[PDB]
């Protein structure tokens, strides 16, 4: 039928968009977006093009996808948002862009980690400062009761621990 053919072609377009976003082809991403691909498409595990673009550090693709209507607060099977992946990867510009566009700064994954938790765990000072600028909760606690200061102090991070101590 025409309906089934339309659905199959749309699914092929969504798969092509996801592959292009993972690979980092901005031209193909824009071309597929113009042709009618779904910007909110997801895998079987719930991973969206914004997730891959933010995790792999494609700033231009992230900004292009934001202007089309990509949900900036979307969780996969493991409860991660694009801000979580961007903060744990260490991309400062994508984190800043997500925060400006209105990313939730106090979202929690399946373990209760916040973006500040992952920023302290990975060991990026600039991301910690940027997240604290926009109103991150220093005293957040995960399921096991650990705090972003504890994760910093027990992982060998020194300057991040000092900053978190100053922030109280």
């Amino acid at each position: 039928m025409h309906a089934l053919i339309s659905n199959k072609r749309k699914e092929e377009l969504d798969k092509k968009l996801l592959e292009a976003a993972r690979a980092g082809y901005d031209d193909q991403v824009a071309a597929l977006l113009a042709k009618g691909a779904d910007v909110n498409a997801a895998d079987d595990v719930g991973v969206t093009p914004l997730h891959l673009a933010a995790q792999r550090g494609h700033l231009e693709i992230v900004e292009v996808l934001l202007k089309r209507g990509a949900d900036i607060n979307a969780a996969d099977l493991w409860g991660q948002t694009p801000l979580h992946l961007a903060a744990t990867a260490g991309h400062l510009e994508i984190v800043e862009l997500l925060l400006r566009w209105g990313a939730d700064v106090n979202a929690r994954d399946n373990i209760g980690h916040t973006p500040l938790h992952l920023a302290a765990w990975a060991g990026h000072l600039e991301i910690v400062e940027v997240l604290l600028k926009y109103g991150a909760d220093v005293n957040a606690q995960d399921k096991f009761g650990k705090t972003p200061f504890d994760l910093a102090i027990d992982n060998g991070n020194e300057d991040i621990a000092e900053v978190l101590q100053k922030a109280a």
Binding site: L77, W78, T88, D109, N110, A122, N155
Partner: protein, 228 residues
């Protein structure tokens, strides 16, 4: 050594294949996911594909990849798993449950194609029929544990031992003592770590769109113990 470290410099797909029999019952679980060795992140999903699993899911968490554990820059010399990866290693496990049956586990971890494959063989004996395990009396959660790794100096492997504490639905803790030993497969010099330990965190979830026996797992692992 350095080649294994260079291998784990990004997101690596992970395939896990387990087949086993406990008290005669037969099952085989297939799992797929991704791992990030830079931060110790692991995101996996497991399916039973043979019906209903005869045992509670958490009991198989420790059996279902030590090479994706984060090691700080001052501990890079104590990374045995990455140093022996391109060919893989062999894990022998004895899981003695408290006042219940035991598990014997033989696994091989190899790097095939672009993916990392963990192949496991299980054998469970002496389990009761009204007990927590075979009676399905364990709840859906997982705690955090410390795994102590020491050297062997004779078999080019390492030794480990720890205790998993499960949670019964009646407010009780069941203690499963795990004994482990790792041996290399390929014939090449590998790093032999000093005595240290690994800290672990896990979170078990559920997929609302899967109509089978599934288990979603998110896991973080790090190394500690040594001061530099």
């Amino acid at each position: 050594m350095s080649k294994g470290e260079e291998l784990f410099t990004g997101v690596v797909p992970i395939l896990v294949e387990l087949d086993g029999d406990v008290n005669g019952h037969k099952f085989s679980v297939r799992g797929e996911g991704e791992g990030d060795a830079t931060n110790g992140k692991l995101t996996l999903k497991f399916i039973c594909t043979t019906g209903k699993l005869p045992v509670p899911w958490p009991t198989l968490v420790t059996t279902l990849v030590q090479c994706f554990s984060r090691y700080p820059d001052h501990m890079k010399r104590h990374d045995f798993f990455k140093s022996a990866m391109p060919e893989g290693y062999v894990q022998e496990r004895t899981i003695s449950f408290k006042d219940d049956g035991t598990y014997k586990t033989r696994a091989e971890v190899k790097f095939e194609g672009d993916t990392l494959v963990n192949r496991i063989e299980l054998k469970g004996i002496d389990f009761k029929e009204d007990g927590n395990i075979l009676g399905h009396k364990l709840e859906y959660n997982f705690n955090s544990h410390n795994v102590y790794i020491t050297a062997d100096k004779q078999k080019n492997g390492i030794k480990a031992n720890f205790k998993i504490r499960h949670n019964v639905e009646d407010g009780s803790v069941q203690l499963a003592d795990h004994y482990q030993q790792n041996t290399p497969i390929g014939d090449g010099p590998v790093l032999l770590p000093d005595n240290h330990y690994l800290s672990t965190q896990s979170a078990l979830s559920k997929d609302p769109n899967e109509k089978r026996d599934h288990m979603v797992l998110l896991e973080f692992v790090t190394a500690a113990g040594i001061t530099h």
